[PDB]
PDB file of C-alpha atoms and ligand atoms in Angstrom:
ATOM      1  CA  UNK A   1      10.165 -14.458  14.139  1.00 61.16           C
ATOM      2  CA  UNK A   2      10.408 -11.802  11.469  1.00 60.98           C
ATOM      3  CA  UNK A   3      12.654 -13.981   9.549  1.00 61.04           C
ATOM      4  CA  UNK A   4       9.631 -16.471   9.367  1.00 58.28           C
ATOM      5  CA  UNK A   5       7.318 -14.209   8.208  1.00 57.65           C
ATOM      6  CA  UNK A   6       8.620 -11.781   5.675  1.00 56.85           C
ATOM      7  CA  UNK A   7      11.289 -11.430   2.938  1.00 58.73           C
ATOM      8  CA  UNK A   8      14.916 -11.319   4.388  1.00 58.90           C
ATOM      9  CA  UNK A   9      15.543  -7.507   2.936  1.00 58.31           C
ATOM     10  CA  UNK A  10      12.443  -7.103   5.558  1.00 57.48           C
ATOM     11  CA  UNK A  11      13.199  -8.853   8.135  1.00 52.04           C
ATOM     12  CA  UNK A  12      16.584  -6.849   8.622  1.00 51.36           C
ATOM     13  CA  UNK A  13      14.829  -3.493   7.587  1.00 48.00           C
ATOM     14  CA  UNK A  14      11.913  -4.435  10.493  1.00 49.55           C
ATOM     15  CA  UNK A  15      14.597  -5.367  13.015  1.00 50.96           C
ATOM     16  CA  UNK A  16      14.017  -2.300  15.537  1.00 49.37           C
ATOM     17  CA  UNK A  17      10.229  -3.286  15.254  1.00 47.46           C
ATOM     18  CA  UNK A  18      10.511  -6.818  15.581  1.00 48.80           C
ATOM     19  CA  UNK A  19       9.421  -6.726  19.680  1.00 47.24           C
ATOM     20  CA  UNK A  20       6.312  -4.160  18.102  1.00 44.30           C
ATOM     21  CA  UNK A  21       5.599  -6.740  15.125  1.00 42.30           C
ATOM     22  CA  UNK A  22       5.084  -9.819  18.345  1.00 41.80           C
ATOM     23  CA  UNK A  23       2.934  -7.087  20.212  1.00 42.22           C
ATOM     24  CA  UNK A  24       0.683  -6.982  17.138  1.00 42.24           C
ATOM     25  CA  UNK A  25       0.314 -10.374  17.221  1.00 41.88           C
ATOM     26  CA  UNK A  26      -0.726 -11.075  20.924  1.00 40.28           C
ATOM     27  CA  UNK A  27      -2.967  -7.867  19.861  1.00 40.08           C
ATOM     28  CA  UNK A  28      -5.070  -9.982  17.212  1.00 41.78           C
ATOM     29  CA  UNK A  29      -5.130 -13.295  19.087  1.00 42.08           C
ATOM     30  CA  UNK A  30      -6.511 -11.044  22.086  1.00 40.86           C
ATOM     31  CA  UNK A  31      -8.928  -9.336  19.236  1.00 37.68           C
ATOM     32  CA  UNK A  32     -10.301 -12.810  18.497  1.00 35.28           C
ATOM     33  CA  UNK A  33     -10.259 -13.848  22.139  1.00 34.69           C
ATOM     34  CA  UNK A  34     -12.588 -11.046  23.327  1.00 36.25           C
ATOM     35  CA  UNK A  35     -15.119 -11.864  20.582  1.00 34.89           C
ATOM     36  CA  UNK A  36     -14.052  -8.965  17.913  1.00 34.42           C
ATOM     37  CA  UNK A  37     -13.025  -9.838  14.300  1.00 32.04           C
ATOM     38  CA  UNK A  38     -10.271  -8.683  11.979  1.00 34.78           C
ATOM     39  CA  UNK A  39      -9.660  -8.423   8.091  1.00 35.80           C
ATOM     40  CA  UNK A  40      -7.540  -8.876   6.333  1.00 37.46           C
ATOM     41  CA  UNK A  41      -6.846 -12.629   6.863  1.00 39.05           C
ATOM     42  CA  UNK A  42      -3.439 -13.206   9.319  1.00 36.92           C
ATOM     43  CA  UNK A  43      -1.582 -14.792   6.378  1.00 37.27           C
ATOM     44  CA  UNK A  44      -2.197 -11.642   4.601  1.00 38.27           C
ATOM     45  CA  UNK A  45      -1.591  -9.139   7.156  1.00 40.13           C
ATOM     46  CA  UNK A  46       2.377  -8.901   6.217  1.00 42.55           C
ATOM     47  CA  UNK A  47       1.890  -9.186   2.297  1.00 40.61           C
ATOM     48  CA  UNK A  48       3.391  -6.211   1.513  1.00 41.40           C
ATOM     49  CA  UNK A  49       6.384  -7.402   3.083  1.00 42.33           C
ATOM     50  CA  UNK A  50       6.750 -10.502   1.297  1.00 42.74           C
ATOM     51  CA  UNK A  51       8.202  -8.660  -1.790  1.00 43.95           C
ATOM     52  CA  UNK A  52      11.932  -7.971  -2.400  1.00 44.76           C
ATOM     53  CA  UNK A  53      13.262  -5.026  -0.181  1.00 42.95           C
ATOM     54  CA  UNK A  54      15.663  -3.937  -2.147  1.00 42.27           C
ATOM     55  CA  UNK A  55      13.409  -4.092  -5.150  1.00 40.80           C
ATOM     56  CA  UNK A  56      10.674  -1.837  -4.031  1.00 40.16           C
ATOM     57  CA  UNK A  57      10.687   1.308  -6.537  1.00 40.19           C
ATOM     58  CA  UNK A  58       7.558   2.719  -5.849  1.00 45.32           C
ATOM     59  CA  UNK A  59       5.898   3.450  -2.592  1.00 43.42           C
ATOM     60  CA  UNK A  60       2.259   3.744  -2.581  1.00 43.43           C
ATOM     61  CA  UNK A  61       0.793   4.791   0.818  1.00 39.85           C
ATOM     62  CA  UNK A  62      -3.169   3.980   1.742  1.00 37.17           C
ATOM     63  CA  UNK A  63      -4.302   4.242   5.213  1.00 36.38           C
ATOM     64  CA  UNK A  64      -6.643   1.269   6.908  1.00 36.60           C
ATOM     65  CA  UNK A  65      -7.406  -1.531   5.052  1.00 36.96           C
ATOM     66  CA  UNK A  66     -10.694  -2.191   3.495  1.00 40.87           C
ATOM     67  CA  UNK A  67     -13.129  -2.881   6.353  1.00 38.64           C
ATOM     68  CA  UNK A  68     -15.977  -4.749   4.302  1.00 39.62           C
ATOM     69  CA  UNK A  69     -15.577  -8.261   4.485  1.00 38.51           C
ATOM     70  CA  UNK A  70     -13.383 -10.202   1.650  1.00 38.00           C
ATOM     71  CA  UNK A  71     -11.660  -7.044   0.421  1.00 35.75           C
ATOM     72  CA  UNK A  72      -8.884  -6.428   1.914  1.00 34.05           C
ATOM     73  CA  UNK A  73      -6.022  -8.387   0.681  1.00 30.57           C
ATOM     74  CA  UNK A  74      -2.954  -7.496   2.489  1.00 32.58           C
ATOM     75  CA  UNK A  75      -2.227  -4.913  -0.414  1.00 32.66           C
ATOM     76  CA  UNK A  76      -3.166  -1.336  -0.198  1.00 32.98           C
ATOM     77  CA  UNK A  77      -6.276  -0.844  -2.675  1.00 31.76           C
ATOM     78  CA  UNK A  78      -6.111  -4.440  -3.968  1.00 30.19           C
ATOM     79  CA  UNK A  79      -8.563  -7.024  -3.605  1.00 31.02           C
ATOM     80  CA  UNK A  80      -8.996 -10.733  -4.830  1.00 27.56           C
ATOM     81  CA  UNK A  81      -9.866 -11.355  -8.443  1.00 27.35           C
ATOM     82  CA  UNK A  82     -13.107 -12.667  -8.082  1.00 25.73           C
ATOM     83  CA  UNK A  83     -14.473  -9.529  -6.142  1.00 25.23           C
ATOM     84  CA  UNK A  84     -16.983  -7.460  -8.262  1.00 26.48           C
ATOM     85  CA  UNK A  85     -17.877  -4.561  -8.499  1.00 27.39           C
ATOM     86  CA  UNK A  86     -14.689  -3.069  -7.478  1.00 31.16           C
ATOM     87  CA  UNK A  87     -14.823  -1.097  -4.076  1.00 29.70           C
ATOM     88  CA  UNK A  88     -15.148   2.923  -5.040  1.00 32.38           C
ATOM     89  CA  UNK A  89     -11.440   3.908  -4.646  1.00 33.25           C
ATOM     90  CA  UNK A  90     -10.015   1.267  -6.853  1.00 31.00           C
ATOM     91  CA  UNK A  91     -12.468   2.076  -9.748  1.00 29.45           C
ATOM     92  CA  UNK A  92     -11.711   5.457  -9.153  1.00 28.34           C
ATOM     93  CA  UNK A  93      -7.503   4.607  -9.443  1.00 24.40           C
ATOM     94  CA  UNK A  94      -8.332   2.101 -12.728  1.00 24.70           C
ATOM     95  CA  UNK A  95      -9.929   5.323 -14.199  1.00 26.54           C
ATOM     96  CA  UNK A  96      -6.909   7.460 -13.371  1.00 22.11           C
ATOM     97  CA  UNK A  97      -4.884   4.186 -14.673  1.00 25.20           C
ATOM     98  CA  UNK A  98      -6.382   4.195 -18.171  1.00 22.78           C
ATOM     99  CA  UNK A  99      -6.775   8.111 -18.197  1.00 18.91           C
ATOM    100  CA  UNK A 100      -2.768   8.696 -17.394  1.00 17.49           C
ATOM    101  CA  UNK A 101      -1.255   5.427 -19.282  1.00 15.85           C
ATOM    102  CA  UNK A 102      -3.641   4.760 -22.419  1.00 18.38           C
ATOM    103  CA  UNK A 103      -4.083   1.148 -21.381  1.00 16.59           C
ATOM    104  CA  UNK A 104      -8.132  -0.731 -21.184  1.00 19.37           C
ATOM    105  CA  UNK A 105     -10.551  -1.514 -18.422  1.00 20.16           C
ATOM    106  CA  UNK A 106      -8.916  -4.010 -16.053  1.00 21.03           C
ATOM    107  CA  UNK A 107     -10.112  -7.614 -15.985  1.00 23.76           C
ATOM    108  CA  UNK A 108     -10.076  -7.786 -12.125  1.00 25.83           C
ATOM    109  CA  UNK A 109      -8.886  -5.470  -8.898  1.00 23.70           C
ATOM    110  CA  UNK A 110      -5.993  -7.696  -8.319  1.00 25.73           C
ATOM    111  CA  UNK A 111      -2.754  -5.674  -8.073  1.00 26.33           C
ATOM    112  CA  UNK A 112      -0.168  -8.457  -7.572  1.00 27.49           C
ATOM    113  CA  UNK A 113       1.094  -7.808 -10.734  1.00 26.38           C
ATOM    114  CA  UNK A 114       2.355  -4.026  -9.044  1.00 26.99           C
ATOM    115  CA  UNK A 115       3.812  -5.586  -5.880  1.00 27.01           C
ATOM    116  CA  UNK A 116       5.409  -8.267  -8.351  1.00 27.21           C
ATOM    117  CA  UNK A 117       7.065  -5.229 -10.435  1.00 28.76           C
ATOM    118  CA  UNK A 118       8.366  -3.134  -7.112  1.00 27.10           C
ATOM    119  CA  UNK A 119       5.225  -1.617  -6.106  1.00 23.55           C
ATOM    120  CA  UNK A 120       5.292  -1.506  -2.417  1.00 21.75           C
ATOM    121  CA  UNK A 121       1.248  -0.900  -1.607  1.00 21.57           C
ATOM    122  CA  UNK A 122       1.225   0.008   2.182  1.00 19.71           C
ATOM    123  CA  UNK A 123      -1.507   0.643   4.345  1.00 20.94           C
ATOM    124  CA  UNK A 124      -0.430   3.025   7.602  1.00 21.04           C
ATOM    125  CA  UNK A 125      -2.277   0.347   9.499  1.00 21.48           C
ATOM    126  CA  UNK A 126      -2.229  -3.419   8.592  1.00 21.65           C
ATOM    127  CA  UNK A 127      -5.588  -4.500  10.277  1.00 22.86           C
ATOM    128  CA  UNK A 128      -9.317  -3.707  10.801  1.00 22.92           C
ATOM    129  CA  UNK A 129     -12.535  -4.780  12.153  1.00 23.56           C
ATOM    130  CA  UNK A 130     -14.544  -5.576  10.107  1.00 23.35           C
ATOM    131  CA  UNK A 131     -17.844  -2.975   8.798  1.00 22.57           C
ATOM    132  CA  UNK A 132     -15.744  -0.403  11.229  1.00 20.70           C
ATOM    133  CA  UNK A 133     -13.311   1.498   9.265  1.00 20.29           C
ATOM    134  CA  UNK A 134     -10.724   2.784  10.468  1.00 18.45           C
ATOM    135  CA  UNK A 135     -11.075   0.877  14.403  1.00 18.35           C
ATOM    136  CA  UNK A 136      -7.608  -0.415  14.898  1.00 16.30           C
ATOM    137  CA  UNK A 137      -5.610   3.151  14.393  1.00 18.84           C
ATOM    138  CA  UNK A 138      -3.441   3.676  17.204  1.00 23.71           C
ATOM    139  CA  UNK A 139      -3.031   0.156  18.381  1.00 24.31           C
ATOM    140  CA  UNK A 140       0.851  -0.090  17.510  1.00 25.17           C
ATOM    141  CA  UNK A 141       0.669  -0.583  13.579  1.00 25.69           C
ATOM    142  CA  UNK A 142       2.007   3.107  13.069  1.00 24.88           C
ATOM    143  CA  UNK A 143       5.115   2.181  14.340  1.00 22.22           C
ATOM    144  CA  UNK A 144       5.831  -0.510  12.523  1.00 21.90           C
ATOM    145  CA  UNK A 145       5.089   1.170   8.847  1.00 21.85           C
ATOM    146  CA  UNK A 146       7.018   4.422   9.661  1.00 25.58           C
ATOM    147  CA  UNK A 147      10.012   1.993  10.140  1.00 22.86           C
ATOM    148  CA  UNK A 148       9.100   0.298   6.756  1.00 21.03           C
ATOM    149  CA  UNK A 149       9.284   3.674   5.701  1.00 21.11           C
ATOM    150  CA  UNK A 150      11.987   5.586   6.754  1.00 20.84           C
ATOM    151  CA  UNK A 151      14.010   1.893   5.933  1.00 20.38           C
ATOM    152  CA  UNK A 152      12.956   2.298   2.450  1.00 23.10           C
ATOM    153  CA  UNK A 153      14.099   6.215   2.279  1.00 27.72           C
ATOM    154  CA  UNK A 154      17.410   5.428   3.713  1.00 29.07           C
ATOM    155  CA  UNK A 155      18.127   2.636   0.473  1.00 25.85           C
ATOM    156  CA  UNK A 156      20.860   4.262  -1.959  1.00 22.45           C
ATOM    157  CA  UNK A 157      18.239   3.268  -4.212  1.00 21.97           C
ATOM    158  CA  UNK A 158      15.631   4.940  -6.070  1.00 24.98           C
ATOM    159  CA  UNK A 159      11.905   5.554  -4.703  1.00 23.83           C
ATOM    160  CA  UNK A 160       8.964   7.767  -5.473  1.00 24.57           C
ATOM    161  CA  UNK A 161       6.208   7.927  -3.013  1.00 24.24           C
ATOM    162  CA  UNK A 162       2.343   8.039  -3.968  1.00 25.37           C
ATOM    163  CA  UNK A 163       0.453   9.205  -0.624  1.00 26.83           C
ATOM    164  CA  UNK A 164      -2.999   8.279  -1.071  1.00 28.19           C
ATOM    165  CA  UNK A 165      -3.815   8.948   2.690  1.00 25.57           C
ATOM    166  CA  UNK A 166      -4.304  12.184   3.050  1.00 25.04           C
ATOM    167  CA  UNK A 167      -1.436  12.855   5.993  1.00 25.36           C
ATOM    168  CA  UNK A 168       1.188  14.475   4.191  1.00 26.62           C
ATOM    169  CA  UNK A 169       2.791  16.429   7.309  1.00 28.93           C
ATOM    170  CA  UNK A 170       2.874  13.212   8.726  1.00 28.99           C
ATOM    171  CA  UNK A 171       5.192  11.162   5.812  1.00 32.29           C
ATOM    172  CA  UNK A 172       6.714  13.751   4.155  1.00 31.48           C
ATOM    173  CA  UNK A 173       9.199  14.119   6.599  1.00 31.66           C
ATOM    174  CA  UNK A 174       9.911   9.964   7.221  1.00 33.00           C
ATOM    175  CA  UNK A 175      11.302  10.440   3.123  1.00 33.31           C
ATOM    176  CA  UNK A 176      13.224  14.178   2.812  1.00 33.22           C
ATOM    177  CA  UNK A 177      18.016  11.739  -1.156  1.00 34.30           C
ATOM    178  CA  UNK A 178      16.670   9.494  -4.140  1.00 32.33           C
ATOM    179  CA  UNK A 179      13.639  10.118  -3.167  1.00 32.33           C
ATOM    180  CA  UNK A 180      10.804  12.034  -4.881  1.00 31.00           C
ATOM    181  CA  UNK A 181       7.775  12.380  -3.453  1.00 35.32           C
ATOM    182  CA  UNK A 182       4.701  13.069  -5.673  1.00 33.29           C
ATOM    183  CA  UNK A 183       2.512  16.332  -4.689  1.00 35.38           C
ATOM    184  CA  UNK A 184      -0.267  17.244  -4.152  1.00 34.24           C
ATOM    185  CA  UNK A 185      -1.521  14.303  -2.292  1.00 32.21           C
ATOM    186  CA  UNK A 186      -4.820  13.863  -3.738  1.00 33.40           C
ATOM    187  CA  UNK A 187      -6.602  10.533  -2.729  1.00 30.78           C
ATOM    188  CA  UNK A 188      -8.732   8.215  -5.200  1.00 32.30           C
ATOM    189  CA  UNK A 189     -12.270   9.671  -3.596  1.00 34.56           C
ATOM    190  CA  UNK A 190     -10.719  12.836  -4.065  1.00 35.43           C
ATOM    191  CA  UNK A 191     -11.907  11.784  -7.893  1.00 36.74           C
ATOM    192  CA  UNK A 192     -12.465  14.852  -9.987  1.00 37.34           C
ATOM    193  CA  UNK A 193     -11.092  17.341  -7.241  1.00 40.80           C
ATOM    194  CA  UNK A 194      -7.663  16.629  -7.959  1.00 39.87           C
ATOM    195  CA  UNK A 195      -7.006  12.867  -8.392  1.00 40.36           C
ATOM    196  CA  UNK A 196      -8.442  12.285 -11.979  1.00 43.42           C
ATOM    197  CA  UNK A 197      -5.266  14.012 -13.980  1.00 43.55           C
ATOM    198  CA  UNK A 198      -3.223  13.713 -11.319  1.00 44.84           C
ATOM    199  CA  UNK A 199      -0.924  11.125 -13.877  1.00 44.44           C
ATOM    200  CA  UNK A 200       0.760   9.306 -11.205  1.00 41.41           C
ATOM    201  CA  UNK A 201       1.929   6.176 -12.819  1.00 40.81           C
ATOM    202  CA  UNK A 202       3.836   8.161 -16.186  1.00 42.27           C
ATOM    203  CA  UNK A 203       4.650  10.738 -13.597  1.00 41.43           C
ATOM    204  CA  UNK A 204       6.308   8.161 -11.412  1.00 41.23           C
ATOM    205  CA  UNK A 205       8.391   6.523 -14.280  1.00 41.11           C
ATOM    206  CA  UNK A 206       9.520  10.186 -15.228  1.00 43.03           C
ATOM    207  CA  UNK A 207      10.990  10.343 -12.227  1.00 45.81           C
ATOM    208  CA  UNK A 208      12.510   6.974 -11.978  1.00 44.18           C
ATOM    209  CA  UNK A 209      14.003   6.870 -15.576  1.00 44.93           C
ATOM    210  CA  UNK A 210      15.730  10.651 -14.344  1.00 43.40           C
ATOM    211  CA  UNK A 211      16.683   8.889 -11.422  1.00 41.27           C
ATOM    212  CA  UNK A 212      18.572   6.311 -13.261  1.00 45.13           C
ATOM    213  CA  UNK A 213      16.184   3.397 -12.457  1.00 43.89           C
ATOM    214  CA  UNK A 214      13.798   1.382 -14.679  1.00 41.77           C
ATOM    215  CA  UNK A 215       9.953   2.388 -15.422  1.00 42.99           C
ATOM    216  CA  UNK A 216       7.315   0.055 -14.048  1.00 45.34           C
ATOM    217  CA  UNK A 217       5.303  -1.833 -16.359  1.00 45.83           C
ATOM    218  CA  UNK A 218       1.756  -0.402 -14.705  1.00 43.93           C
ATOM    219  CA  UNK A 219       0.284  -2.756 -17.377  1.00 42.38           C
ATOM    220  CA  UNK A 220      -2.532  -5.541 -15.700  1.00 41.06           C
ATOM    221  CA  UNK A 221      -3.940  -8.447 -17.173  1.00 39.79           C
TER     222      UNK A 221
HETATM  223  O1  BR8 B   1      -6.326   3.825   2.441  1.00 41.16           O
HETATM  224  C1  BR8 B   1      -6.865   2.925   1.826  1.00 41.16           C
HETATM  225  C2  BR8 B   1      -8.236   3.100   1.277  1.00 41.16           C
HETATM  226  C3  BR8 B   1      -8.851   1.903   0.643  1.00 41.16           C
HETATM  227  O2  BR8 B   1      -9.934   1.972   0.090  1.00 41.16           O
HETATM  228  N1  BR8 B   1      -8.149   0.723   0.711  1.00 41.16           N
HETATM  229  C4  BR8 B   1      -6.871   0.567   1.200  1.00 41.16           C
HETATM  230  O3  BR8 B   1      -6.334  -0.526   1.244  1.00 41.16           O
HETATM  231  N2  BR8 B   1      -6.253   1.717   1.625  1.00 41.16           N
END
């Protein structure tokens, strides 16, 4: 069970989801059975949750994972290091990245390094089919990530969100202490209506180091 399958601060925040997590399971063997695919791989689908609890910092909301085939990686806005060119919204965040924090280009779009540092990169909704974006919405993933949510808001411990999703009304309340929340809510293909500028990565260490936490070192290879 849960216990298998994610980090231990996890696996007790999941607990009133566990019976959901099983459902979403039988859901994707059932997907495969009736002939439909789904991204990202299964031993990716709970990546977010296989770093520290306790540890996440920074909360960084997308929506659906990337639906074109060997993107999606598990991790909100991430892909492998091999892919090239970058999907759209992640060129759009490295030019926000080296607008806000000074630092070069990139090498790849792998951002392991984030969820390494306490960078908790959550999609809404863990799975997709594949060149349909968007298609598994409202199939019991919802549930499971507002618990992962409102788990991480009830911490003592620090947090600033980052909702790149568009669906504000929606969060906002699952995290109103400890926590700031980063507004507007511009999203990467927002680009140059309101997410270039937007200087969420010094922004967010502001707020942690007046929180009493650490920075994040935003820095990738
Ligand atoms: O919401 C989103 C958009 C995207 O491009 N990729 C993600 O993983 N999340």
């Amino acid at each position: 069970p849960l216990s298998e399958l994610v980090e231990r601060g996890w696996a007790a925040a999941l607990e009133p989801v566990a019976d959901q997590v099983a459902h979403m399971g039988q859901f994707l063997r059932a997907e495969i059975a009736a002939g439909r695919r789904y991204l990202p791989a299964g031993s990716n689908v709970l990546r977010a949750f296989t770093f520290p609890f306790d540890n996440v910092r920074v909360l960084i909301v997308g929506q659906d994972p990337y639906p074109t085939p060997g993107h999606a990686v598990g991790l909100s806005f991430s892909v492998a290091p091999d892919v090239r060119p970058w999907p759209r919204s992640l060129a759009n965040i490295f030019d926000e990245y080296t607008a806000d924090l000074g630092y070069p280009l990139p090498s790849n779009g792998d951002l392991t390094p984030w969820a390494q540092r306490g960078v908790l990169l959550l999609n809404r909704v863990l799975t997709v089919r594949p060149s349909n974006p968007a298609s598994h919405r409202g199939k019991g993933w919802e549930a499971v990530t507002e618990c992962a949510i409102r788990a991480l808001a009830a911490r003592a411990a620090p947090l600033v969100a980052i909702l790149w999703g568009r669906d504000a009304s929606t969060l906002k309340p699952m995290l109103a202490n400890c926590v700031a929340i980063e507004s507007p809510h511009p999203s990467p293909l927002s680009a140059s209506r309101g997410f270039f500028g937007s200087r969420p990565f010094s922004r967010a260490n502001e707020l942690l180091v007046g929180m009493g936490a650490e920075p994040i070192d935003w820095r990738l290879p």
